[PDB]
Amino acid sequence: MENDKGQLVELYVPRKCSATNRIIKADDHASVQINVAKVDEEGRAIPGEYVTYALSGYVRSRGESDDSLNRLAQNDGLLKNVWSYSR
Amino acid sequence: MRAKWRKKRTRRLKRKRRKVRARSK
Amino acid sequence: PKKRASNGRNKKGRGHVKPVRCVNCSKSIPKDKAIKRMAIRNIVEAAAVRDLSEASVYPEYALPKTYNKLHYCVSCAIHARIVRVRSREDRKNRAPP
Amino acid sequence: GRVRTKTVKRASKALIERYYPKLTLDFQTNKRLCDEIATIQSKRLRNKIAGYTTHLMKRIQKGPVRGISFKLQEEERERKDQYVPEVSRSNGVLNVDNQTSDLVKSLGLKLPLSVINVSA
Amino acid sequence: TRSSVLADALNAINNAEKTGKRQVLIRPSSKVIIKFLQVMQKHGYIGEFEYIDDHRSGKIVVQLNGRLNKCGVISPRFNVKIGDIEKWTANLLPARQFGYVILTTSAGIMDHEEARRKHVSGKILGFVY
Amino acid sequence: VLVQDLLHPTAASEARKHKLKTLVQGPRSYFLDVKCPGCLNITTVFSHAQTAVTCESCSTILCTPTGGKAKLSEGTSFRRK
Amino acid sequence: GWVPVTKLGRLVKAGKITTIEEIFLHSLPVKEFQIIDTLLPGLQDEVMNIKPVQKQTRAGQRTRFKAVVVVGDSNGHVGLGIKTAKEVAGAIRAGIIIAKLSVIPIRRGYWGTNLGQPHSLATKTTGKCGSVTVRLIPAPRGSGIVASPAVKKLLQLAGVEDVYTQSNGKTRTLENTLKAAFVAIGNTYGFLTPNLWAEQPLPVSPLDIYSDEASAQ
Amino acid sequence: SLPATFDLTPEDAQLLLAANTHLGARNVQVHQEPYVFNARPDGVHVINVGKTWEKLVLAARIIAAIPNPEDVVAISSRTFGQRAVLKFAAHTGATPIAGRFTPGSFTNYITRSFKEPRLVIVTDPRSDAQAIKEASYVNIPVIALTDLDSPSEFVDVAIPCNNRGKHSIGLIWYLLAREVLRLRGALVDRTQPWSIMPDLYFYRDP
Amino acid sequence: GKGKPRGLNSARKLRVHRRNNRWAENNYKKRLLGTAFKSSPFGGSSHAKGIVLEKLGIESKQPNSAIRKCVRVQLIKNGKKVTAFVPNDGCLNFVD
RNA sequence: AGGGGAUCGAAGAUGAUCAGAUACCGUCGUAGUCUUAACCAUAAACUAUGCCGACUAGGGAUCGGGUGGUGUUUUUUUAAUGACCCACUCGGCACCUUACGAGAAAUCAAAGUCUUUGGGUUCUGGGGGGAGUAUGGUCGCAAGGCUGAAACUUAAAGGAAUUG
Ligand SMILES: [Mg+2]
Ligand SMILES: [Mg+2]
Ligand SMILES: [Mg+2]
Ligand SMILES: [Mg+2]
Ligand SMILES: [Mg+2]
Ligand SMILES: [Mg+2]
Ligand SMILES: [Mg+2]
Ligand SMILES: [Mg+2]
Ligand SMILES: [Mg+2]
Ligand SMILES: [Mg+2]
Ligand SMILES: [Mg+2]
Ligand SMILES: [Mg+2]
Ligand SMILES: [Mg+2]
Ligand SMILES: [Mg+2]
Ligand SMILES: [Mg+2]
Ligand SMILES: [Mg+2]
Ligand SMILES: [Mg+2]
Ligand SMILES: [Mg+2]
Ligand SMILES: [Zn+2]
Ligand SMILES: [Zn+2]
């Protein structure tokens, strides 16, 4: 949200649901941001180094949080099978 | 008074003004 | 406001049933709004069962109960029978015991 | 009726919480402990209190009591934990359903076998 | 009976978006629905859509992102007098710096901004933002 | 649910939907060649019928109609398509 | 002395989080009012309204006092707090606090044309509470705040220079009106416009980066 | 982006089938689940144990990704989880909650049960619903042991198992722990059936 | 979708309907029926000059106890008889 | 206007009750209640919720129809039937649970998809009384139905929920 001359104006460009791309606003105290850790050879789990996702309070209320995550992590590489895109 | 009795009240009242007016036709 | 979704009592897809006469006051009341008890009981009673068997021909006989459907009128249902009156919530419960 | 007020019962809790070592099954000494460790304004209330911190003490020795947890118990249990020497791969093979086995066949490999069926 | 086949295809979209979905199937499609669908896509408010061909009137599968708050239809196709395009965008768009009135002119189904640049006007279909 | 392939639905969950609610709609009736070896020729019957279909030359009955699929008669034989 | 009892509280006092925009970014639940006191000290209290309410009891009539308070700077941060105690100053102490907790951001904007510093709104927004709906509309500069004296002060403290308003319903009930105007400017930062379509990497949480420098003992 | 050896071993499958973790629910069957796998006739559905193990891994991945391993709470008011969870928390960072939850533990600093974690493991979202509801007032991701009839409202990543009873719960909890340790961890290498008995995590007697 | 017609040719029905319903306006009806000119002691004009018939002592409604000094007036352009209050302390002493 | 007229029973008459008791309760019982041929056109005629069309969320029952199964049961010699069990699917009467959403609330799968306000169409309401009254027209054998004002008066009347 720039201004007259290129300068950045208006604080705070909010997070978004990785699932719906809706804005995750402040009073949305039901939203969630999962940190999934990257792992290296021989199972070591590398502290402070995550593949991360964010889900809106909406999606979680609707119970879609598990399925939505399933897709997301898997077509990113953390799952193998589980989720199907057909029904 | 009960509405239905008041509806009956004016039914009577009406039938009377129906009479009086008829004396004059 | 509206006090019940069954309104008075239980009729959805009909518009007219047919009055039964109340067993206790003779009041007419729709059949589906009736409040109904199957009063079954032995023709004898409590203590008479021994005296009955004993002063009889036959080995223990058989014994027959009396089967009587009962149709109360709401006010009659409340004044005695099944009624209490229940809280806003407990009202919703259709379970018998 | 001799049901104790809250002030008493509450004081027993708080005491047993932070002075379980010291204290005893005995009232008389539990009595005297109170004078040292805590401030009370009447002889009566102190007795009142101690006779109940005594009572509470007396059946803690025979298993825990809700409300009171002086950490020593939660660790006493955590060591006390252990069991087993059997498990539940003996003997022979795993008995599966038709479809369980198909679940096996359609993902993995090695598995002992055993069929079933069942009805309505 | 269906009066505006457009109205259904718009509504259906909005509902999916609101329910947080990513795709709608709509029925039964028309030339008009497609072109309206096409404008929305030109500006990002949906992704890819696809015409499946029943030997009937058609179905459409739309794939939507999430940048869509509303896509509505204007029920009578009111005539608009190029001077009064202003008044419309005002009544029913969120701000003057984005969002579109999309309408039907003699020179194609176009969003009001294109309509202005080309200098044509006409009747008014719905809108997007 | 929330995200899925409307365009490539699975054959089973497609097979179980209503005949007008599949992706593109089509019938799930079928035709067969039917024969009772008294003769040497086969007649073609619709899986559903309404008319009690008689064979080529012989007054015979082949099937009686029902509320849907015709019941083929007594001892016969058939092959779809 | 402070002594926080919050992962978030400790981190703030510990000078590890400098601005609320951070908190709003990760949508952190605030519980300790002193958070928004060190985090935003330019605030000013406003007692919007005070009404007597009363209750009947098995031995008494509890007439206590309800007070509505709005706090904010005049620079994009509001908070509306409603509390009822039986002393008036008591109701005003607590209300200010509650209103500090409720402190939220405003997305302000230009009526149209870039120029220098957002003076209005980014979109129209509606807020409803009870029967009242308050509808906020972008307006050219020097339009002012077109609103009734209560809502105008709320928009002012919230830091909006020019906006239009329309209201609907029994607006005479101040409690619902401000709560709806409060919802309305709150809604501005959940409105997705094309300038916010750009994907962002998803920032990392203060609760994890200063994991150590938070935490109980 | 896949480990390589973290495939589902034959001994684990054996492990799981013996515990009946794959034995689903009956007529009941929440629509929100493709974790299913063919209806075993007369009631029971069979649970895709691969996707079980595979969720479990993700669970573990997420769990041992909390900087301080203790604000990883394991709830279970279900007795069948109480013994298990206490054990889980023992072996890993994890603070435990067995027995009664007590409401106002995530909201309300004033409470003495007060936690403020970064993640919740939980065993029956029906029985332990207070925790799931509470956390969603305050931004806490929720890993959860679910079944074929469990409410997936506000639980991300469901470990699809069998809270019908017995060992399954314990089995999973053990496996959970057993994996969170094999990660940046105080453990080992390849197969390694692990020292600790799986029957340690179990509901006791009578 | 409830109510009114929407269509592009339904202008007439839309005007008629309004016409029909405007009648429930208390002020509109008074205007169009010419109630003013017809009822109402004045013509419909702002003031009216009349002649004093008797001085009244109207007793006030509850919850007020008083005697409101008034006058019976016969409007000149009219013959219409009307009663009117005489405002302020005394003033009835001025009329006759 | 005929027939019928067992029953229960406006009216009437009576026994009691009561300060009174034109009633409630008890008795007698006219009309009526039933039927034919004509009238009448109103009911809290109610779900106090117009109709057609789309979309939006879960669950177990049930009525009708249909499809599927090396299902159960009927014995004869196995079938064929029939009733039953499981899955699915149209269309019904409803209930359960949630609520994204709606509401002033009670509540509501519509009373949702509405100030981010437009799918098509019908009808009615515009503070309370005055009053469904007056008047005219029209229908009716009548009782009455439909249509249906004003003068004047008045600051409330009303809804839902809360505490007493
Ligand atoms: Mg005469
Ligand atoms: Mg009421
Ligand atoms: Mg009542
Ligand atoms: Mg009826
Ligand atoms: Mg005021
Ligand atoms: Mg009128
Ligand atoms: Mg006079
Ligand atoms: Mg003249
Ligand atoms: Mg008779
Ligand atoms: Mg009499
Ligand atoms: Mg008498
Ligand atoms: Mg009499
Ligand atoms: Mg009527
Ligand atoms: Mg009704
Ligand atoms: Mg349903
Ligand atoms: Mg069959
Ligand atoms: Mg007054
Ligand atoms: Mg009450
Ligand atoms: Zn009765
Ligand atoms: Zn033949």
Swiss-Prot record, chain B:
Residues 1-25 are annotated as: Disordered. Its main location: cytoplasm. Keywords: Cytoplasm, Ribonucleoprotein, Ribosomal protein. GO terms for biological process: cytoplasmic translation. It is found in: Cytoplasm. GO terms for cellular component: cytosol; cytosolic large ribosomal subunit. GO terms for molecular function: structural constituent of ribosome. The keyword Nucleotide-binding does not apply. The keyword Ribonucleoprotein applies. Component of the ribosome, a large ribonucleoprotein complex responsible for the synthesis of proteins in the cell. The small ribosomal subunit (SSU) binds messenger RNAs (mRNAs) and translates the encoded message by selecting cognate aminoacyl-transfer RNA (tRNA) molecules. The large subunit (LSU) contains the ribosomal catalytic site termed the peptidyl transferase center (PTC), which catalyzes the formation of peptide bonds, thereby polymerizing the amino acids delivered by tRNAs into a polypeptide chain. Belongs to the eukaryotic ribosomal protein eS32 family. Present with 11900 molecules/cell in log phase SD medium. There are 2 genes for this protein in yeast. Component of the small ribosomal subunit (SSU). Mature yeast ribosomes consist of a small (40S) and a large (60S) subunit. The 40S small subunit contains 1 molecule of ribosomal RNA (18S rRNA) and 33 different proteins (encoded by 57 genes). The large 60S subunit contains 3 rRNA molecules (25S, 5.8S and 5S rRNA) and 46 different proteins (encoded by 81 genes). This is Small ribosomal subunit protein eS32A.
From Swiss-Prot, chain D:
Its main location: cytoplasm. The keyword Transport does not apply. Pfam families: Ribosomal_S17e. It comes from the Eukaryota. Transmembrane segments: none annotated. Keywords: Cytoplasm, Ribonucleoprotein, Ribosomal protein. SUPFAM superfamilies: Rps17e-like (SSF116820). Belongs to the eukaryotic ribosomal protein eS17 family. This is Small ribosomal subunit protein eS17A. Component of the small ribosomal subunit (SSU). Mature yeast ribosomes consist of a small (40S) and a large (60S) subunit. The 40S small subunit contains 1 molecule of ribosomal RNA (18S rRNA) and 33 different proteins (encoded by 57 genes). The large 60S subunit contains 3 rRNA molecules (25S, 5.8S and 5S rRNA) and 46 different proteins (encoded by 81 genes). Present with 30900 molecules/cell in log phase SD medium. The lineage of its organism: Eukaryota, Fungi, Dikarya, Ascomycota, Saccharomycotina. It comes from Saccharomyces cerevisiae (strain ATCC 204508 / S288c) (Baker's yeast). The keyword Transmembrane does not apply. It is found in: Cytoplasm. PANTHER family: 40S RIBOSOMAL PROTEIN S17. GO terms for cellular component: cytosol; cytosolic small ribosomal subunit. GO terms for biological process: cytoplasmic translation; ribosomal small subunit assembly. GO terms for molecular function: structural constituent of ribosome.
Swiss-Prot record, chain G:
Coiled coil: none annotated. Keywords: Acetylation, Cytoplasm, Isopeptide bond, Methylation, Nucleus, Ribonucleoprotein, Ribosomal protein, Ribosome biogenesis, rRNA processing, Ubl conjugation. One of its GO terms (biological process) is rRNA processing. It comes from Saccharomyces cerevisiae (strain ATCC 204508 / S288c) (Baker's yeast). Signal peptide: none annotated. It is found in: Cytoplasm; Nucleus, Nucleolus. One of its GO terms (molecular function) is small ribosomal subunit rRNA binding. This is Small ribosomal subunit protein uS5. The gene is RPS2. Belongs to the universal ribosomal protein uS5 family. InterPro entries: Ribosomal_Su5_D2-typ_SF (IPR020568), Ribosomal_uS5 (IPR000851), Ribosomal_uS5_C (IPR005324), Ribosomal_uS5_euk/arc (IPR005711), Ribosomal_uS5_N (IPR013810), Ribosomal_uS5_N_CS (IPR018192), Ribsml_uS5_D2-typ_fold_subgr (IPR014721). Gene3D superfamilies: 3.30.160.20, 3.30.230.10. Component of the ribosome, a large ribonucleoprotein complex responsible for the synthesis of proteins in the cell. The small ribosomal subunit (SSU) binds messenger RNAs (mRNAs) and translates the encoded message by selecting cognate aminoacyl-transfer RNA (tRNA) molecules. The large subunit (LSU) contains the ribosomal catalytic site termed the peptidyl transferase center (PTC), which catalyzes the formation of peptide bonds, thereby polymerizing the amino acids delivered by tRNAs into a polypeptide chain. Residues 43-106 form the S5 DRBM domain. It comes from the Eukaryota. Pfam families: Ribosomal_S5 (PF00333), Ribosomal_S5_C (PF03719).
Curated annotation (Swiss-Prot), chain H:
GO terms for molecular function: structural constituent of ribosome. The modification N-acetylserine is found at S1. Keywords: Acetylation, Cytoplasm, Ribonucleoprotein, Ribosomal protein. One of its GO terms (cellular component) is cytosolic small ribosomal subunit. One of its GO terms (biological process) is translation. It is found in: Cytoplasm. The keyword Ribosomal protein applies. Required for the assembly and/or stability of the 40S ribosomal subunit. Required for the processing of the 20S rRNA-precursor to mature 18S rRNA in a late step of the maturation of 40S ribosomal subunits. Component of the small ribosomal subunit. Mature ribosomes consist of a small (40S) and a large (60S) subunit. The 40S subunit contains about 33 different proteins and 1 molecule of RNA (18S). The 60S subunit contains about 49 different proteins and 3 molecules of RNA (25S, 5.8S and 5S). Interacts with RPS21. Belongs to the universal ribosomal protein uS2 family. This is Small ribosomal subunit protein uS2A. It comes from Saccharomyces cerevisiae (strain RM11-1a). The chain holds residues 2 to 207 of 252 of the full protein.
